[PDB]
Every structure is written in structure tokens, then in C-alpha cells.
Amino acid sequence: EVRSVFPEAIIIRPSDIFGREDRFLNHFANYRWFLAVPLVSLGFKTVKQPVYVADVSKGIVNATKDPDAVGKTFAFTGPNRYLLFHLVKYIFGMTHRTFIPYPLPLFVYSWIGKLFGLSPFEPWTTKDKVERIHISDVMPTDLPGLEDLGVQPTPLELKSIEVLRRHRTYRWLSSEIEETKPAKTVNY
Amino acid sequence: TYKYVNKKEQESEVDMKSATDNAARILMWTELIRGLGMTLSYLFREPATINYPFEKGPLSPRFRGEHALRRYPSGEERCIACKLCEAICPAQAITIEAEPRADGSRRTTRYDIDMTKCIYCGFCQEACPVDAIVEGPNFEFSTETHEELLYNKEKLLNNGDKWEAEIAANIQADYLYR
Amino acid sequence: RAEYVVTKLDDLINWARRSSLWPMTFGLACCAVEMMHMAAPRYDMDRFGVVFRASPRQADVMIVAGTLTNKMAPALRKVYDQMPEPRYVVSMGSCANGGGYYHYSYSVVRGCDRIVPVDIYVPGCPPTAEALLYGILQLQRKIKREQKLKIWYRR
Amino acid sequence: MWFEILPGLAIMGVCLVIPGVSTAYIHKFTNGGKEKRVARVQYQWYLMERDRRISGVNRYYVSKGLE
Amino acid sequence: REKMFEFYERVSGARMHAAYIRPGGVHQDLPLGLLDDIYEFSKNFSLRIDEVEEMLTNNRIWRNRTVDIGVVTAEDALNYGFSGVMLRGSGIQWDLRKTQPYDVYDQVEFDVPIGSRGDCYDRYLCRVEEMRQSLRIIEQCLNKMPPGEIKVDDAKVSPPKRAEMKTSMESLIHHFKLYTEGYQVPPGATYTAIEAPKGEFGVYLVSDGSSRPYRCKIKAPGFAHLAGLDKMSKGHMLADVVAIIGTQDIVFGEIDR
Amino acid sequence: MNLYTVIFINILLSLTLILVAFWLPQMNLYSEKANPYECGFDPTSSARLPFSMKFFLVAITFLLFDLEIALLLPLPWAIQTIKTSTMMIMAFILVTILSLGLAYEWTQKGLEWTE
Amino acid sequence: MFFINILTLLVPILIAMAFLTLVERKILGYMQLRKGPNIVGPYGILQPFADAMKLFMKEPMRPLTTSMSLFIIAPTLSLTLALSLWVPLPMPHPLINLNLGILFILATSSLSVYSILWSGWASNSKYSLFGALRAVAQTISYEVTMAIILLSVLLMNGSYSLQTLITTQEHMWLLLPAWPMAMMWFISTLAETNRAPFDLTEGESELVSGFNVEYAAGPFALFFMAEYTNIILMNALTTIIFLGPLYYINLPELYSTNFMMEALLLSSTFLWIRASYPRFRYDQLMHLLWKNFLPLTLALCMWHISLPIFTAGVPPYM
Amino acid sequence: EMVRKCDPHIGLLHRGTEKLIEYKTYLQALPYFDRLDYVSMMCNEQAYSIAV
Amino acid sequence: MELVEVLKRGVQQVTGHGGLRGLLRVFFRANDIRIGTLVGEDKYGNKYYEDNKQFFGRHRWVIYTTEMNGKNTFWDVDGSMVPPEWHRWLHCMTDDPPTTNPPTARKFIWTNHKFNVSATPEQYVPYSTTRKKIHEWVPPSTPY
Amino acid sequence: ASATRVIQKLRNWASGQDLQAKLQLRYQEIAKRTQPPPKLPVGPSHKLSNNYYCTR
């Protein structure tokens, strides 16, 4: 309904974004308030390549200047196509609190969101905020991406201090990403 | 001439009357009581505060505040684009690009103060040979934004089209002192 | 009715924030002298519910008096990023608004607004103590006209 | 002038009389018009637990008229 | 104090930063109702000191909190370069109004308060008491003031009257040069050491034939006193090091320049 | 029991007043206002190092006297003994040896803030 | 019918404290020739509600380097205790009479310290570790004397029950027998209740908002609610232990009415102090109170032991 | 709490009003001298108005 | 006497501002009840009382009015009011008000004075009042 | 003026000196406003003769 209204429009289709005051890493980070993490299928069957904000923003800002991108769709995905169980284990090794799974089906883990969806404020979860995490599955096929727009995207291995250094306790408030065992990346 | 301030120590073989005089300063710490009665002397005074927006304190005709471009009694913008009011403005605040007015006269097309500059020093109202730029007695012109302090020429003539009843009285009160 | 209740709550929520706002023991230049003369017995802050507390955690507004140098700048945003976030800002002076003198020097930031966002700007080289007082009465209505519960109902 | 202080005092001054005068009228209501009848020793507790046993279980009453 | 900012605002325009004392003497004369108010201010200020000097110069706390703090000796102050009040507070009789009177201070009688045992309370008294001997000088500077002129009588160094530059030409030219270029001082160099209340406020001008200068330089009394904050803070703890800084008359403008 | 009715309240008056302080301010906690203060800079050391006090000896003389204070407290009942001449003397003997113990330290530079 | 007595015992002290925040800003003002609050209410009568309702909307800082358990428990422990000290405090007949009703005060008075130590120790900061340590050597200083200045008074009274003093003062104030005790008590009511001419712990000018600086609005009020609530106790005791108002038991509201008249003075007497005197540098306060008051205390402690036995004046154990 | 060695880092208010006088004439630099000691204004003007 | 002459002098303050609806208004709106000689009542409602017996800060006070230029100044009271003929008076610059020493009108000066337009519309936005100082080119509509 | 002569004696005593003569709240003793206009004296050297700048 945009192409049929304003053709020759740029449409960026980014992956699930992370950054300071995000809703992606600071989501799984705050599962620690409960007993543990209820993530589906022990995390597997959910392949994810997240992307950093500035990679998206530097992509937009350069898309509003090229003679290219007069209709070209895009996909701002980033490298290191992680797997969710290892994507979260990285977070809770970075955020040194603890990590034990607590697997579930969508029979209940989509209903818990309907309990927290009954919040007049900014909810902690929803019917659908549970399901984006689990729909999240894609392989890059043909689309242009960042690297043919101006940006050389950033891996999550590097800019994860800045967004999880808050979620730690004293006795882990300085821990040097030299430490913490980088995640296992899947190519498929 | 020099004056000693703390120099009195001389053991006069202090008599027992001068001991209690000292031994009751201590054990009743009375030198401090002379301070408590001193602050008790002030709550019973009239507090000098003034209800500000209803009682705005005293000023004088030379109080220099918000700039304004005065105007002759028959219209005719009193500025003549000399440029000896940015050649002296030490904060480097004024840009007064000019032209012939198309009457053949000589007036500004541009005038400016960056009031985030403008040290409020008075060099521009005392340098102006025509009494065009003055520095009015405003002091309530705070702004929520940075752009409202970049008075160019239309915010600054009509400002002078506002306070001219209040400026000229002070200028008339002071053209003998300057 | 719900909106009328929320407008009055949001008018009643602000009465506290605007009356009892606790500015912060800043300094740095001549301009700060006038804040003392605004703590003085002529134009009393305390009569307006305005109190110096010298810690940001206890604070509700920053008053930036004086040239905000490049060395002081980290210590100015390390401090603005230590309050809670109903935090407000006030820029006393022409050294803090634009850097009036020292706009072209090398060790001076050309405005408090380069670094911390600001609600109000008080001009004057030494703005009269009855000219911050006009500002922190104007900041005292700039958030009388904030609608933080209204735009929650319609959202 | 200084007389503007009295509201802060005489409203604070109708605020520390209550916990004194309320502490008695609330005792008399509960204790039957008498005082709370404090017990510091083991004897004054015996008289209560005696007087508790010469009536209904409340102890702020019966005396002579019986025998 | 605000009662004295009205003695600038009633004289200059600005309460605080009054560009009033120029090389060409003084920009602008007094108005008719000014000295008659300093008298009504000066007769009473001497009691307000007594209303404070009472509150502080006889306590224990003030006298047990400042005393024996900052016992910087005589010959080490000079090695450190204090020169203002942190040396006469230790007994060095020195002042640039009895030794180097620059403006009218020759014919101004007053006393230079000196104190032995300089320990942040003995210089306090030297600081409360030069408020008196200056209040003594107002009694003189108000009484004797000759009915003369107010700026230098030399229109190439001090601009003419704002009405003299509307009848006459030359006054209009010099007005058009003084307030555009300047007046072309000759090349040279000086050191005007002045006793501000902090002390020897110095200015090392270096001129050239231009109307601009060539490297002024300012001597901050406080750039030498704050370096004395290292030896005076020896033996003394956190709660009275906080008092040393106030017994140097610190202002972080003159120094940080 | 009557006091538990007074004091479980005051915990709740405090505990009910704190839950309505964390869950009713609308917070925005991110990184740099949570980190410690030291007056507009990043703290050099770690805030949890040896303080190395200087009144170390007086803290002990208090630690000994809080016993001695406790060792006085039964005097309001001791006067209600029939002797009141050993209570007389032995109350002088306790207070005197204290001042002797206090005056020795007073001269041997105990309560003087080593420096 | 007991909860309706607590409700009329805690509301009328949190509503009083609130207007001590006001009265501590006006009386200090008129001494400074400056009107205090005049505007939010008629004469500032409605400023603490702003101040109170302002503080329960701002972000309670959960600092990144801290102990969030003791962080939250100290203000819970401060507002609890100093509010809970009013329980036995006998306006003529107390809520809770106690034999040892004053050791209840001393002991619980000491736990007002651990709200100041656990706070500043939890909160990682140099300027709060100090304020914690600034209380350690303060409690060490006066607590030797808040007992003996409190014993030797209760030595020519009998039991520690605060209710007995109303009968000991049935015809005279104990200020006249023991003004030396009452002097040092006043200063020891002023070290405890760290609000003072010698604050040393919430030092704005040395230790900026010491023991209190990492604390933002929510937890922050619980100290002001506790400190200005504790100012009124240690003056309310002086209106019981030294200044004995009128019992006359058919109008017991005469005690409570004169109990007002003196407690406000002693609560308004502290206000002249803060506006009149600076601090003791934290080495004098312990050289001012082990050297000058401690021997003078033990003397009068010894004098009041040889006061009744010399004469006859033995207090009875009722 | 006792102080063994302090190390002030004055300089957090440097602006450079020994380098701006270099580009401003002797009247156009007079009010810089009020700023040095912002408490004693005229005593600075009184100094700079003599060296000139 | 004497002790009551204050009371007899402090009672007319209450009973001198009309009645309750007037006294109740001046109090919460200005926070001081004082009787003084009226000399003003400007256009759009500013009263400008006076009392020379009070000290030098409180002998000239304004009592604003509601219904400013569509802004409802019953609580939102400014000092950017007080137009340019009483500013010279209220601020104690001069000794006589603009009734017996009124100013000279000059047929350009405003009649309707505006307060400090802060963040509404009717505020100030800068220009580049310069006539654009360059001219590029005119391509024709005629191909070749 | 706001003294009523029973607080004067208190206020004069608690401080210990007379301050109804040396008060800091200015009423009428001050110089007023709107002073008469002056006629400033021309300095020296305005004397139309024997004033060659080369001499001075």
C-alpha cells in the first residue's frame, strides 16, 4: 500500500536490531528477573542474524543520497547468522548472572504474553512479541544489503559490552570481552 | 601604619575574678549565647524579600539590557549602517550588510545581534553617532530556544517600536552625562 | 469521565515538580554570583520552593552558569547523566548559551546546548538575579504545560 | 514579618496533642472509663487475672453488691 | 551587597560587569543622588560587621576550626609568591597602597591590618578589618572630591562628549577612530601590580605601534596561593582543607585564564 | 502481642511506601546515571578499598566501656538494697578506676588521631 | 480499637514532621532576613506535600555498583525505628507502657546508625563511605554519655519507665537538680539526631549528601521522614525527663498541652542552632566529648549516687 | 581522612583571555578584566587602566 | 494599646480588598495583602498601587489582571507585562508615574503591548534579510 | 516602622546594640529619583588658545 501509492520508494527490511536501550538484547537480559529463561524448543529452530542500529542508520542516511535506490528494496541483516540458544547463552555469559533453559511450546508461552499484554503501560511481552522471536528465520537470497549502500556492518561479538554492561552485578562489572567465549555461528 | 589584630597575650597573673570570668565563659559556653541572641535579633526584622512579578526591584536609567533600534520622530530608521558598532563589539556579534535603500538614502538591509553573544557592555550605544542602537531596560526576555536570541532587524526595530516611550525618558535623563 | 480526571492529575502531578524543584549547586563563573543573589534576601528561591541540593540524585534541574570549557564538558554531562529523568536544564549567561565571549576560543564549548539538551535559556552576561528568576519561573510553567498523562490516555 | 511562622507551628501544634489526648480517651473507651491499668510487677497482673475472673471476661467492672 | 550593586547600576548600567574604569580616566560621571546614598550605606555597614564579627570572632567552633590551620611561615610565602594577604597575615608588613600608591592613595590615611601567627583566623581578622579601614576611606573619598572632569582631556585617548561630536568635526573623527581602531599606543612593556583584595593583581602588557596589543599577560593572585595548597595541607584533614581554600580568597577566573 | 500490632505496621508503612516508589516513577535507567558519582568524573579506584581509620584505639575504649555502661545500669535497683554502703563504695570504685583508666589513655596519647 | 490509636499516633507525627521541613525553612529564613515559602499555600503550609509528592515520582536510582538489598532496607530501617520510638513515649498514658521504656529508646536509638552505615557501605562511593564512617566515630563519642547522662537522671528516679518521671516531676522540673546533665543531654540529643550544627555525616560542603548521595528521591525521603521525626523525640524526652509539665489527673490534656509548648521550643531551639554555628571538624567532636563531657559526666554520675544516700532521696521501685 | 598529597588540576575554566586580547584593541579588551576576578571587578579595570 | 494597634492596623488589610472574593483573590494570586494608594489601572488591567512607608523594594507594586491578549493571566503571571511606561516607574528608575508625567507618542509606537512570546506561535524566527546576493542562470524552453 | 516598640527593646537587646538608627531597610533618607539635570564642567584645555597638542 506504499508501492501502490508512492512508487519508486526505498523499502528497508532490517533484521531484529540491537543497541543501547533496545528491545532485543534488553529483552532476553531481563528474563533473569524470573527463575530462568522460557525459550522455545531449547532455543533451536530459530536462526537469527541481528543488526546494529548505526549500521541501519548509516544505511538509511546513505540511501537518501545515492542515485541508486530509486525503488530498490533492501535488507539490513548483518553478519554472524547466530542461533538463538547460543545467542542467549552469549548474553548471559556476557551478563554473567546465570543461564538455565526452561523450554516450552507456544501453547503456553504465547498465552503468558496475553497475561503481560494486559498492561496499560509498555508491556513486557505480547502475543506477537513472543512470535517474532520464533518466526525469526531467514537466509539471504539476492537482496542488495548494506555493503552495496555504504556500510560495512558490525558483528555482535564487539558491540555487546555497551548494551549489557548495565545488566551485570558488581563482581562482574568489569569483565573484558577477551573473556566470555564467543558464540557458535551457523551458516546453513 | 600597620595594626596588629591578634596580639594581646600577656600573663597579668590573672586574679580569681578574671578566672570565673573565663571559667564561666567555659562551663556555660556563653560566648555562643551572644550568637543565639544575635540570630534571634533578625527573625523579628522585616525580611527584605519582595514578591518579584508584583514587586520588581529597583533599577536606574542606564541599566543596559535588551538591544533595540531607535527611530526618528518621523519614521525613518535611525540606523545609517556605519559599521562602527561591530568594529567595537568585542564579542564579535553584529553583521550589518547594507545597501542604498532605493530612495537614494543609506540604510541597512541586514542588522544582527547574536544575544548568546553580546556581553551587554554598552560600547554600541555610546559609539552610535545617531542614537540608533541602544540597550534597553528589559531583563525579562528569557527564551525556551536558541533561535529566539538571534535578533536580526525585524525583532529589533519593532522592539524599538515598543520601548521608545520608556527608552527616551532614560536617554533624555542621561544625554548630559555622556 | 477519564480525560478530565487525567488532565487534572497531569495538572496536579506538575504542581509538585514545578513548585518543589531542587536546583543543583553549580558554579564555574561570574554568572554563579547572581544565583547567590537569587539565594539572597531580595529574590528568594526558597520562597518559590527552590532549594540548593548539591547532589544530582537529589536534584530536579541543572542551572548552567559560566563558560562550559572542553575539560569541564565531560563533568557536565557526567552530571546531567546522574539525575532521574524528569530532569530539566537552565543555561544562565551568554557564555553558556553560545559562548558569548570566547565563542571563537579553543577551550570553550559554543553553548551548553552542544552537550546537554535545554528547556530554557537566560540571556545576559551576568543576567540579573531577577532574570534567572524570570527563567526559573518560566521553566516553572514550561512544565505546567506538559501533558504526560494525557498523551498516555490517547495512545 | 515573623508572624507567618505561627501557621507552621499552630498546625504542627494541633498535631502532637492528639497522640496524648487520643491515647487516654481511647483507653477509657476500651477500659470502661478507667485508665489502662498498667502492670509492671507480677502482683498487679494477678489482680487483673483475678478481676478477670469475678465477672464476664472483661475486667473493668463488678465490685460490691454481691455478698 | 546588592545595596552596592545599585552603586554600579546607578553609576554604570550593569550591576556586576561595569566597564566603567577605562584608560581614558572614567567613561561617565556620577549622578546627583549617589554619594548621598553611600553615606547612608557606609554609616551602617560598620555595624553589620559587628553583627557578624560578633558571631564568629569569639566562638569556640570558628576559633577551633580555623586556628592553627595554614601556618605557612613568613619566608616561604615569598618563595611561593603570595604577595596579597597570605603574607601580611603572617606578619610581613607589605601593601601597594602605602608602598606603591598608584591612584590617589598618597593622600588617603588608613591602616594596613597585619597579623602575627598566620593561621586562617589571624588573616580572617586581617580580612574583616580591611573591610573597616576601607570603610574608613569612603569617609574620605566622599568628603573630598574636586569639581573637575571625569575622563582624560585628550581626545585621541579618551573619546569626546557625545554632544561635542555633533557640533564639531574633529571630535567626530576621533570618535570614528577610537571606536573602530584605537589610538596606537607606543611599543613598550610594563608590570602594573595592584592590590586587589586577593592581592598583587598584575598585568604584563607588551605593546607594539598597532592599536591592538601584543600579548597581554595577567598575574593571578591565586595562581600562587593555590600552589600553596600543598604544604598548608600537611597534617590537616579533609574537614579543614576545605577551609584553606576559602582562606586564599579563591576565584577560578583569574587563575584559569 | 500488642506491640507486634504497632511494629509490623511500621514495616508495612515503610514497605508499602517503597513499592509505590519503584513502580510509580516511570524510569529510564540506561548506563551512565547508575554508575557512581565522584563529582563529575570516572572514579579512579574501586570504592571498596581499605579506609585505614585513625580513631582505631578509641573505638576499642568504647568497646570496653559499653560493657562498663552496662555494668552501671543496675544502680537504680541496687540502691533498693538494705546495705547501701558496699553499693556506695563499690560504685565509687568502679567509676574511679574508669577515670584512672581514662586519664592514663588521656596522657599516653590514645584518643589523639595518629598522624 | 487499638489500630485507631496507632492511626492517631503515626498520622499526627508524619503530618507534623512534614511541617517541620517547612518550619526549618522559614525560621531559618527570617533570621536570614528572607521569607520562606509563601506561595504554594497561604504561608507555605502546603509545600511539604509538593516536596513529598514530588519525590515519589522521580527515578529511585538503582546504581550499578551497589548492594541492592541493603540499599532498600536502610530507609526501611530508619523510618521504621525513629517512628517506632514514639510507641512508649508517655504523653501522660502511653500507647505501650514499659518498665525498661528508655533502654528501648537507647537500643533502638543505636539502630538508627545502621541505616547510615549499611546505606553508605552498600552504595559504592567515597563520599558515602565517609558519611558512614563519620557516624561510627560519632556514635562512639556520645553513646557513652547518652547512657550516663540518662542513668544519673534515672538514678534519682527509680525504674527506667518513662511514666515514673511524671510523678517525680509532680512538683518540680528536673532541669534544676540537673542542668549539667541537661546541657550535655541537649548536645547528645544533637549528635544522635545527626541534624546539627555539627552534622558531619550529611555534609553538603565536604561529603556532599554523605550516606545519602547515591540515593534518589524515593528512598531519599525516608531519611528526612526519619531525621525530622527523630528531632521531635529527643526534644519530647527533654519535655519529660527535665521539663516536667502538669499532670493533675482530671484534665490529662493539660500535660499534653504543656508538653506541646516546650517541645516546640526545644524543636525550635535546634533551629536557632543550625542557623548559628558551624561544625566540629570530626576530630574535635570526639575530643570535645571524651575529654570535656565524659569526666564531667562521671563526676555527676558519682554525685547523684552520693546525693540520695547522703541525704535520703532514694527512688522507690513501684 | 587526613590529607597526605593533593594535586589540583585547575584548568577546567580556561578560556584563553591572554590570547584574545591579542586580537582586540585596548578598549575592546577592557571588560575581559572584569572576568578574571569576577568578585572584584573595578580593581582589575583599575589595573588594566593604568598599564595602558 | 500598642499591642492592639497592630491588630487594628492588620484588620483593614482583610477588609480593604472588596470582600472575600476580592481578598481571597489577591492573596493566592499575589501572596500579600497590603493597602496602598492606587495610581494606575492601565489599559488591559494593571492597578499599580503604592505605599511610601514601606521600604525601598515594596513601595511600588503592580496587581495584574486576568484576560490579557487571550492568555488567561490569573495564575500564569509574567513580568514581560508592565508595558513601557510603568516599567520606568515600577522599577524605581523615576519618581512620578505616567499620569502626571506621561510620555510622548510618536505615531509608530505600539498601542497593544505583547508579553514574552516564549514557545507559542506569535514568536520569533530568524531570517537572512539579504536579497540573496547571487543569480544563477535562465535555461530556455527552446531545444536545438 | 513595623516595630511596635516592644520588639525594638528585644531586638536591640538580644543583639546588644541600637539598630533602629542603623537599619538596612531604606525608606526615605535615600537620594530620590529624577534628580535635576546637571551641567558637567568642561575640563581644562578647552580654552581656545595656547592649547597646541604638540605641547601636551
Ligand SMILES: CCCCCCCCCCCCCCCCCC(=O)OC[C@H](COP(=O)(O)OCCN)OC(=O)CCCCCCCCCCCCCCCCC
Ligand atoms: C552544692 C555542692 C554540690 C554541687 C555539685 C555540682 C557542681 C557544679 C557543676 C557545674 C557544671 C557546669 C556545667 C557542666 C557542663 C559544661 C560542659 C562544658 O564544659 O563544655 C565545654 C565545651 C568546650 O570545651 P573545650 O574543648 O575546652 O573548648 C574551649 C577551647 N578553648 O563547650 C562546648 O564545646 C559546647 C559547645 C556546644 C554548643 C552547642 C549549642 C547548644 C545550644 C543550646 C540550647 C539552649 C537551650 C538549653 C536547653 C537545655 C536542655 C533543657
Ligand SMILES: CCCCCCCCCCCCCCCCCC(=O)OC[C@H](COP(=O)(O)OCCN)OC(=O)CCCCCCCCCCCCCCCCC
Ligand atoms: C527493615 C528491617 C526491620 C527489622 C528490625 C526491626 C527493629 C524493631 C525495633 C527493635 C525493638 C527494640 C527491642 C524491643 C525489646 C522489647 C522491649 C521490652 O523490653 O519490653 C517488651 C514488653 C515487655 O517488657 P516489660 O513491659 O518491661 O515487662 C513488664 C510488662 N509490662 O512487651 C513485650 O514483651 C513485647 C516484646 C516483643 C517485641 C519485639 C518487636 C519485634 C518486631 C518484629 C521484628 C521483625 C520484623 C518482622 C519481620 C518482617 C520482615 C523484615
Ligand code: SF4
Ligand atoms: S553605529 Fe548606529 S547608526 Fe551606525 S550602523 Fe551601528 S546602529 Fe546603525
Ligand code: SF4
Ligand atoms: S552591548 Fe557590547 S557586546 Fe552587546 S552588542 Fe553592544 S557592543 Fe556588542
Ligand code: SF4
Ligand atoms: S556571560 Fe558574562 S557574567 Fe556570565 S560567565 Fe560569561 S563573562 Fe561571566
